[PDB]
Design an enzyme around this catalytic site. Structure first.
Site, PDB file in Angstrom:
ATOM      1  N   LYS A  46       9.145   1.461 -12.589  1.00 44.38           N
ATOM      2  CA  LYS A  46       9.098   0.025 -12.336  1.00 44.38           C
ATOM      3  C   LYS A  46      10.354  -0.606 -12.944  1.00 44.38           C
ATOM      4  O   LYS A  46      10.498  -0.667 -14.171  1.00 44.38           O
ATOM      5  CB  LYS A  46       7.823  -0.575 -12.941  1.00 44.38           C
ATOM      6  CG  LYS A  46       7.672  -2.058 -12.702  1.00 44.38           C
ATOM      7  CD  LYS A  46       6.455  -2.490 -13.508  1.00 44.38           C
ATOM      8  CE  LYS A  46       6.076  -3.901 -13.285  1.00 44.38           C
ATOM      9  NZ  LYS A  46       4.754  -4.161 -13.911  1.00 44.38           N
ATOM     10  N   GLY A  78       6.532  -0.876  -3.869  1.00 41.66           N
ATOM     11  CA  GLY A  78       6.261  -2.308  -3.879  1.00 41.66           C
ATOM     12  C   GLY A  78       7.399  -3.127  -4.444  1.00 41.66           C
ATOM     13  O   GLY A  78       8.226  -2.626  -5.213  1.00 41.66           O
ATOM     14  N   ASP A 121      -4.676 -10.605 -14.075  1.00 45.60           N
ATOM     15  CA  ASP A 121      -4.175 -10.444 -12.701  1.00 45.60           C
ATOM     16  C   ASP A 121      -4.949  -9.376 -11.962  1.00 45.60           C
ATOM     17  O   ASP A 121      -4.376  -8.600 -11.194  1.00 45.60           O
ATOM     18  CB  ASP A 121      -2.642 -10.213 -12.664  1.00 45.60           C
ATOM     19  CG  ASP A 121      -1.973 -10.542 -11.332  1.00 45.60           C
ATOM     20  OD1 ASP A 121      -2.594 -11.247 -10.509  1.00 45.60           O
ATOM     21  OD2 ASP A 121      -0.844 -10.089 -11.117  1.00 45.60           O
TER      22      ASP A 121
HETATM   23  O1  LIG Z   1      -0.719  -1.990  -3.762  1.00 43.55           O
HETATM   24  C1  LIG Z   1      -1.113  -1.041  -4.430  1.00 43.55           C
HETATM   25  C2  LIG Z   1      -2.574  -0.864  -4.756  1.00 43.55           C
HETATM   26  C3  LIG Z   1      -3.472  -1.216  -3.590  1.00 43.55           C
HETATM   27  N1  LIG Z   1      -4.882  -0.944  -3.869  1.00 43.55           N
HETATM   28  C4  LIG Z   1      -5.755  -1.290  -2.749  1.00 43.55           C
HETATM   29  C5  LIG Z   1      -7.219  -1.243  -3.106  1.00 43.55           C
HETATM   30  C6  LIG Z   1      -7.647  -1.442  -4.409  1.00 43.55           C
HETATM   31  C7  LIG Z   1      -8.988  -1.406  -4.738  1.00 43.55           C
HETATM   32  C8  LIG Z   1      -9.954  -1.166  -3.764  1.00 43.55           C
HETATM   33  C9  LIG Z   1     -11.386  -1.110  -4.177  1.00 43.55           C
HETATM   34  C10 LIG Z   1     -11.864  -1.914  -5.208  1.00 43.55           C
HETATM   35  C11 LIG Z   1     -13.183  -1.835  -5.614  1.00 43.55           C
HETATM   36  C12 LIG Z   1     -14.048  -0.955  -5.001  1.00 43.55           C
HETATM   37  C13 LIG Z   1     -13.595  -0.157  -3.975  1.00 43.55           C
HETATM   38  C14 LIG Z   1     -12.277  -0.231  -3.563  1.00 43.55           C
HETATM   39  C15 LIG Z   1      -9.517  -0.970  -2.456  1.00 43.55           C
HETATM   40 CL1  LIG Z   1     -10.658  -0.677  -1.183  1.00 43.55          CL
HETATM   41  C16 LIG Z   1      -8.176  -1.004  -2.127  1.00 43.55           C
HETATM   42  N2  LIG Z   1      -0.292  -0.116  -4.915  1.00 43.55           N
HETATM   43  C17 LIG Z   1       1.056   0.090  -4.405  1.00 43.55           C
HETATM   44  C18 LIG Z   1       2.111  -0.244  -5.437  1.00 43.55           C
HETATM   45  C19 LIG Z   1       1.880   0.467  -6.746  1.00 43.55           C
HETATM   46  O2  LIG Z   1       1.324   1.560  -6.800  1.00 43.55           O
HETATM   47  N3  LIG Z   1       2.315  -0.208  -7.829  1.00 43.55           N
HETATM   48  C20 LIG Z   1       2.332   0.223  -9.177  1.00 43.55           C
HETATM   49  C21 LIG Z   1       1.932   1.503  -9.536  1.00 43.55           C
HETATM   50  C22 LIG Z   1       1.840   1.846 -10.873  1.00 43.55           C
HETATM   51  C23 LIG Z   1       2.135   0.917 -11.856  1.00 43.55           C
HETATM   52  C24 LIG Z   1       2.542  -0.365 -11.508  1.00 43.55           C
HETATM   53  C25 LIG Z   1       2.753  -1.407 -12.548  1.00 43.55           C
HETATM   54  O3  LIG Z   1       3.200  -2.506 -12.270  1.00 43.55           O
HETATM   55  O4  LIG Z   1       2.454  -1.043 -13.757  1.00 43.55           O
HETATM   56  C26 LIG Z   1       2.657  -0.701 -10.163  1.00 43.55           C
END
Ligand SMILES: O=C(CCNCc1ccc(-c2ccccc2)c(Cl)c1)NCCC(=O)Nc1cccc(C(=O)O)c1
Ligand SMILES: O=C(CCNCc1ccc(-c2ccccc2)c(Cl)c1)NCCC(=O)Nc1cccc(C(=O)O)c1
Lengths: 325, 324
Positions: free
Chosen positions: A66, A44, A154
Site C-alpha cells: 500500500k 485498488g 470505516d
Molecule cells: O475491495 C476489496 C474488498 C472487497 N470485499 C467485498 C466483500 C466484503 C464482504 C462481504 C461479506 C460480508 C459479510 C458477510 C458475507 C460477505 C462480501 Cl459478500 C464482499 N479489496 C480489494 C482491494 C484490497 O484488497 N485492498 C487492501 C488489501 C489489504 C490491505 C489494505 C489496506 O488498506 O490495509 C487494502
C-alpha cells in the site's frame, strides 16, 4: 451542550496503558528498502493511497503493498501504530514490513498476501450459512481491536477482504482508525456515507466502538436483503433521512433528546415524519433464503439510533444467529 | 554418511498437505493477554518464562508461557506443532495464544497443570510408579511420532507429573520438529545428558528414535537413582560417558554402519572401553526399583544404533509394563 457519553465496554483500556501505546504522534517510524519488492498489479486506488499485489524478490512470496500519498505524516504515524498494535489479532490484516522507495521517498506498507474472491460472483453464491460464518469472523476482528482500544471507523464491504476458497477473512484499511479515550470529541467526517452511524450525521462527537457496530449492521442488512447499499443516502443530510424512513422519526427525536443534541437546521425541510418499519418489509423472493427470525432480531439489535443500546462485538457473538457457526 | 530413515511413521508428513507441516507459512493469530492475570513463576529458560495464571473471564487456572522472540520461525514451529498435537494422550494442551498489548510479546496459554513436589517425588515413587509414568510418556511419544513430530528434548524438566491425580504431560515443544525422510537436522538439540549418540557424532539424518534414547536416559536415572545417568561435562565428553557403559567396539560398529567421520577432538579422550553389564549399576539404595524386566527394557532403548532401538509402540509391548 450535548450530554457526555462513554463506551459500555473497554472504556479505560488506553487510560491504563503507557503513552507509548497510544501516542502515535511521538511514534518513531522505521522502514526498509522497497528494492526487495517488485509491484505486480493494482488492486485498488483511493484518495491518499494505491494498493498493489507485489512479490518479495528475496523469498518469492506474494505480498500486498500500500503506497501512501504523504498528505499528513500524523495520519501515516496513526495507521502504522494501530497496525503494529493490532498485528496478529484474529482476522486483522497483518503488517509484515514497512518500506520506502529510495528515489520517490514515498512510504509504503507491506501486508501478508491476500486473495480477494470475484465479489460480483461471491455476492450471488453466498448462502445463509456463509453470511453467518463471515459476519462472525468480522466480529472476532472487532472485539479484538475494540479490546485493544481502537475503533476502525470505516467498516464497509470495500474494507473486508474475503478469500472464499480458503474461508479466510481480513478487516483491512486502518487509515481512518483511531484510539478510543473516554470523553474525547472525534471528527465526525469518518466512514463512507452509506455506513455512517446516526451519531456522525447529527454531529455527536463523543462516539465510541459502537460506531463500528452500526456500520456492521448496514453490511448485514445489505447482504441478507440483497440491497446494496441498504441506506442509500445521496448526501450526508439525506443519509439520516434514509435511516429515518426505516427506524422512524420518533426514535430519532428520543435519541437527540437523550444526548441533548442540537439538530442542524438543514434537516428541517427534508427529515419529514416517518413510522417505524417492520424489518419483514424488506423480505422478497430474491432474498428470503438469507432471512430468518434470528437474522432480523440480530439486525434490529445493531441498527439502533442510540449507540449505547447497540450490541457490543462480544454480545453480538452470543446472539442465536451464530448458533450454527 | 550413509542415509537413514525411520522404521515407523516414515512418510506420514509426505502424505499430508503442506499446510500440516509447513510451519513457516502457518498464519498465527492471537488474542488479547488482558484476559489473563499472572499468579507465579513456574520456570525460566533461555527463550521463555512459564507462569501459573488465571483467566479473569471464567476464574479458571491456566499456565502462560511468555516467549522471547529470538526467531519468529521458532515461534511458528512450536505453535503449529502444539496445534497439530492438541488433545493427544498426555500432550500439554494449548488452550489459547495471546499477546500483551504494550510489550507485543507473544505468549502461549496451556491447560492448568499442578507439578508435585519433585524433591518428594524421587523417594516416594515406587517400582510400579516408574512403570506407570513411563507408559504414560510412551503413549505421548507414540502419538506425536504417529503425527510425524519428534520432541527432541525429552528430559525430566520436560515431563509434568501431578502424582495426586496420576496425571502426566509431555511439555515444552520448543525444540520439536516435523520428521521428513532424508532431512538433515541440526544436531544442537536436546539437553547434554539426554543427547543421542547420533547428535554427538554429528549424524544429521536422525528420526523419532532420538526420543527413545532420551527416554532410556530418564529410565536409567530413575531406576538407578543416578542423576544424570550419562554425566558428560561437554558434548565430546558426553559420548565418552556413553562409551564407558556401551563400550567402544559397538561405537565403531555404529559409525562404520553409517560411514560417519568421527571428529578428531575425540582422538585422545575416547579411549578403549569394555561393554558393561547393567547389573553393575544396582546398589542398596536403588535395588527396590530394579528388576530383570527393567534392565532388559533399558538395554533395548540404550543402543548406539538408532534403528536398533525399540519404537514407542514396541516399548509399550515390553514385559516391564505387564503390571500397568
Ligand atoms: O475491495 C476489496 C474488498 C472487497 N470485499 C467485498 C466483500 C466484503 C464482504 C462481504 C461479506 C460480508 C459479510 C458477510 C458475507 C460477505 C462480501 Cl459478500 C464482499 N479489496 C480489494 C482491494 C484490497 O484488497 N485492498 C487492501 C488489501 C489489504 C490491505 C489494505 C489496506 O488498506 O490495509 C487494502
Ligand atoms: O520442571 C517441571 C517438570 C519437572 N518434572 C520432574 C519429573 C519428571 C519426570 C519424573 C519421572 C520420570 C519417569 C518415571 C517417573 C517419574 C519425575 Cl520423578 C520428575 N515443570 C515446572 C515448569 C512447568 O510446569 N513448565 C511447563 C508447563 C507447561 C507447559 C510448558 C511448555 O513449555 O509448554 C512448560
Amino acid at each position: 451542550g450535548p450530554v457526555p457519553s462513554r463506551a459500555r465496554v473497554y472504556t479505560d483500556v488506553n487510560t491504563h496503558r503507557p503513552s507509548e501505546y497510544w501516542d502515535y504522534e511521538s511514534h518513531v517510524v522505521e522502514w526498509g528498502n522497497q528494492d526487495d519488492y517488485q509491484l505486480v498489479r493494482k488492486l485498488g486506488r483511493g484518495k491518499y493511497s494505491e494498493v498493489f499485489e507485489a512479490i518479495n524478490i528475496t523469498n518469492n512470496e506474494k505480498v500486498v503493498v500500500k503506497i501512501l500519498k504523504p498528505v499528513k505524516k500524523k495520519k501515516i504515524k496513526r495507521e502504522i501504530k494501530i497496525l503494529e498494535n493490532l498485528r496478529g489479532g484474529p482476522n486483522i490484516i497483518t503488517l509484515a514490513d514497512i518500506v520506502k522507495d529510495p528515489v520517490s521517498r514515498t512510504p509504503a506498507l507491506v501486508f501478508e498476501h491476500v486473495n480477494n474472491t470475484d465479489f460480483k460472483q461471491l455476492y450471488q453464491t453466498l448462502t445463509d450459512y456463509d453470511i453467518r460464518f463471515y459476519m462472525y469472523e468480522i466480529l472476532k476482528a472487532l472485539d479484538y481491536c475494540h479490546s485493544m482500544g481502537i475503533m476502525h471507523r470505516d467498516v464497509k464491504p470495500h474494507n473486508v477482504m474475503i478469500d472464499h476458497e480458503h474461508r479466510k477473512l481480513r478487516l483491512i484499511d486502518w487509515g481512518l482508525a483511531e484510539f478510543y479515550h473516554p470523553g474525547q470529541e472525534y471528527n465526525v467526517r469518518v466512514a463512507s456515507r452509506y455506513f455512517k452511524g446516526p451519531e456522525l450525521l447529527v454531529d455527536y462527537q463523543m462516539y465510541d466502538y459502537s460506531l463500528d457496530m452500526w456500520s456492521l449492521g448496514c453490511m448485514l442488512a445489505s447482504m441478507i436483503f440483497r440491497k446494496e447499499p441498504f441506506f442509500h443516502g445521496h448526501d450526508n443530510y439525506d443519509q439520516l433521512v434514509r435511516i429515518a424512513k426505516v427506524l422512524g422519526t420518533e426514535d430519532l427525536y428520543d435519541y437527540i433528546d437523550k444526548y441533548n443534541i442540537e439538530l442542524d437546521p438543514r434537516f428541517n425541510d427534508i427529515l419529514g415524519r416517518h413510522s417505524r418499519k417492520r424489518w419483514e418489509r424488506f423480505v422478497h423472493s430474491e432474498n428470503q433464503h438469507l432471512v430468518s427470525p434470528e437474522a432480523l432480531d440480530f439486525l434490529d439489535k445493531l441498527l439502533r439510533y442510540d449507540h449505547q443500546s447497540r450490541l457490543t462485538a462480544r454480545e453480538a457473538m452470543e446472539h442465536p444467529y451464530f448458533y450454527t457457526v
